[PDB]
Amino acid sequence: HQEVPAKFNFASDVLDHWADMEKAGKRPPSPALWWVNGKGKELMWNFRELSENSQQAANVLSGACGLQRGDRVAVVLPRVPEWWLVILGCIRAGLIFMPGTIQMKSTDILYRLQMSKAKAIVAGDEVIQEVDTVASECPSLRIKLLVSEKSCDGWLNFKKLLNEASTTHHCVETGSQEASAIYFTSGTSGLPKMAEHSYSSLGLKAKMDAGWTGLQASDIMWTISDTGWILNILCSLMEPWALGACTFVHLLPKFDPLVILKTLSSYPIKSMMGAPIVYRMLLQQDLSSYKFPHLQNCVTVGESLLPETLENWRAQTGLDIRESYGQTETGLTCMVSKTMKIKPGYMGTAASCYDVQIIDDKGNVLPPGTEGDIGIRVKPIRPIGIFSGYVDNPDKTAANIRGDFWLLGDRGIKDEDGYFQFMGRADDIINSSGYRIGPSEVENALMEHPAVVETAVISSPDPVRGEVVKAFVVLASQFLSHDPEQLTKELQQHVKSVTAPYKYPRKIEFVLNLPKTVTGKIQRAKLRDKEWK
Ligand SMILES: Nc1ncnc2c1ncn2[C@@H]1O[C@H](COP(=O)(O)O)[C@@H](O)[C@H]1O
């Protein structure tokens, strides 16, 4: 049970307010989206232009391609303006957007399209061939839209159709609880589940949290994110547009820290958001060389922000990094807001919607200073911002509910002021830099190679990255005197060729056997614990 309005839509109820203020003279033409590719190309939309161009996107999707309300649309694009336009187009047209990384390989794509029964895919040059290798095995797939300077056989040209579309689209009166997005998300075993979010659980939640980052109406925010991470919708798109502020996007084709640094320095970015890895990469560059006195707000999420990183960023930039915490299923769950005291090692207090607590094995609230499982209260009232459940899987949504709480699956401690301290994943999920990684994903990849008879993938501390994927591998006898160095590279490349490279095992250790339960199941917890002093 939720306490929401009957109807909500981020495009019509927020974005178009800002456009209408411009049309009617109440506000000057303000920048909404500012994009750069780093090679001398830039593009900017004001809120009216964004409204119009996104209405053209809705018309392409629902008119030219005839996609109907409730249809599921896979979106697999790099950091190009068309991503923002296509997501907004889906929201208007009542279509369910399902973003994924351009890193994906064909088997990743097959899995997503088959599991979701996607009716359409919107892709770029990066994944054409990957999609086409598997498209014919997907009987629900009816539309393929390509965003590219090139035309290609079998694919509709998105850019050409966008330009032909009317700038007037009548926004669908979408319901608050109505499906708006599906984000695939990795689990402790098996393959990614489909996390469904509603019009309100993304957009109304965003409108309510708007400003938490310290951003204001006339500022520019840069969210540095894979376009497949829920972070991109929540912070790159909805936070700034809730406030009438500009969002900044850099193609960052190669994710180069020096490019990031010159960008911060050269453009009047007032707020920035990124995973801790971003900050750690910048701290290795020459900060003295590229100053950014316009930068005021530095926020982070996705991984644990080490006190070490916080301290160094302060020392070198004079700025605080304010940590936040969440997951795909819950969005922004805790944070350090602008006016809150920073506590090194602590990821903040409850987001305004949420009763976040530390809880015991029977579902009860624990006192400050005691370790347990982090949760959000969802009975008898589910707060605005929680997802709708895992699609086609009511059992696995039930499995994460304990008493009245949704379990985030992270251990934690709460202090005397309500600040949460992350104490590690309670299960086998791995966190490598941005990304959330399911051990079965990497294990399946590894098992396809003939040198691997048995394997267990787990998380491993790394002094330069924080946390990385490690594979323990039992070799077939005939590989026992290969060069371990060379074989490791081979297996690493193997994984990179069969699934999205972010999950490759950056460490491998060869062993004669793995630990097993009394019914033969591999004990990852045991290996993990060893790996961490
Ligand atoms: N501030 C943080 N500290 C530690 N872990 C985090 C933090 N933010 C996110 N995570 C991890 O990332 C998971 C969510 O990943 P995703 O659902 O891909 O956004 C959480 O359950 C945590 O395990």
238 and 377 fall within a common domain: yes
Q: Which atom of ligand 1 is nearest to the CA of 408?
A: 21
Task: Name the residue among 247, 110, 129 with its Cα closest to residue 184.
Answer: 110
Dihedrals φ, ψ of 365, to 5°? -70, 135
109 and 35 fall within a common domain: yes
In CATH, what number is assigned to the domain containing residue 474? 3.30.300.30
- Taking the C-alpha atoms of residue 273 and residue 299, their distance in angstroms, rounded to an integer, is 5
Mutate to test the pocket of ligand 1, among 197, 327, 459 (most ligand atoms within 8 A of CB): 327
392 and 485 fall within a common domain: no
413 and 439 fall within a common domain: no
- Taking the C-alpha atoms of residue 407 and residue 333, their distance in angstroms, rounded to an integer, is 12
504 and 531 fall within a common domain: yes
Q: Which of 426, 441, 468 is the last residue of a domain?
A: 426
Mutate to test the pocket of ligand 1, among 298, 422, 459 (most ligand atoms within 8 A of CB): 422
State the method.
X-ray
1 and 144 fall within a common domain: yes
Per-residue CA distances from 244 to 16, 20, 331 (Å): 10, 12, 21
d(CA 169, ligand 1 centre) in Å: 37
20 and 133 fall within a common domain: yes
Q: Which of 375, 405, 426 is the last residue of a domain?
A: 426
Number of domains making up the chain:
2
Task: Please give the single-letter amino acid code of residue 446.
Answer: L
- Taking the C-alpha atoms of residue 247 and residue 155, their distance in angstroms, rounded to an integer, is 30
Per-residue CA distances from 190 to 9, 194, 329, 444 (Å): 34, 13, 17, 9
In CATH, what number is assigned to the domain containing residue 241? 3.40.50.12780
- Taken in order 89, 91, 97, 103, the sign of the CA dihedral is positive
Q: What tokens were used for 337?
A: 């807001």
Cα torsion for 339, 342, 345, 350, to the nearest 10°?
A: -20
419 and 443 fall within a common domain: no
Q: Which domain holds residue 472?
A: 427-533
221 and 362 fall within a common domain: yes
* Residue nearest to ligand 1 atom 18, measured at CA: 436
Q: Where are the alpha helices (DSSP H) in 149-275?
A: 158-164, 199, 205-209, 230-231, 239-243, 257-266
Mutate to test the pocket of ligand 1, among 182, 186, 325 (most ligand atoms within 8 A of CB): 325
308 and 378 fall within a common domain: yes
496 is in an annotated binding site: yes
346 is in an annotated binding site: no
- Taking the C-alpha atoms of residue 266 and residue 268, their distance in angstroms, rounded to an integer, is 7
Task: Name the residue among 27, 29, 5, 174 with its Cα closest to residue 96.
Answer: 174
Distance spanning both ends of the chain, measured CA to CA: 44
Cα torsion for 242, 248, 254, 257, to the nearest 10°?
A: -100
Q: Which of 405, 426, 447 is the last residue of a domain?
A: 426
DSSP string of 343-394, one letter each residue: -TT---EE-TT--EEEE-TTS-B--TT--EEEEEE-SSSPPBTB--EETT-H
Q: Which atom of ligand 1 is nearest to the CA of 323?
A: 1
Q: Residue 89 region, left (φ>0) first, then alpha (ψ -120 to 50), else beta? A: alpha
Resolution (A): 2.5
369 and 468 fall within a common domain: no
284 and 384 fall within a common domain: yes
Per-residue burial over 47-84, b = 16 or more CB atoms within 10 Å of its CB, e = otherwise: bbbbbbbbbbbbbbbbbbbebeeebbbbbbbbbbbbbb
Task: Name the residue among 183, 188, 190 with its Cα closest to residue 429.
Answer: 188
d(CA 408, ligand 1 centre) in Å: 9
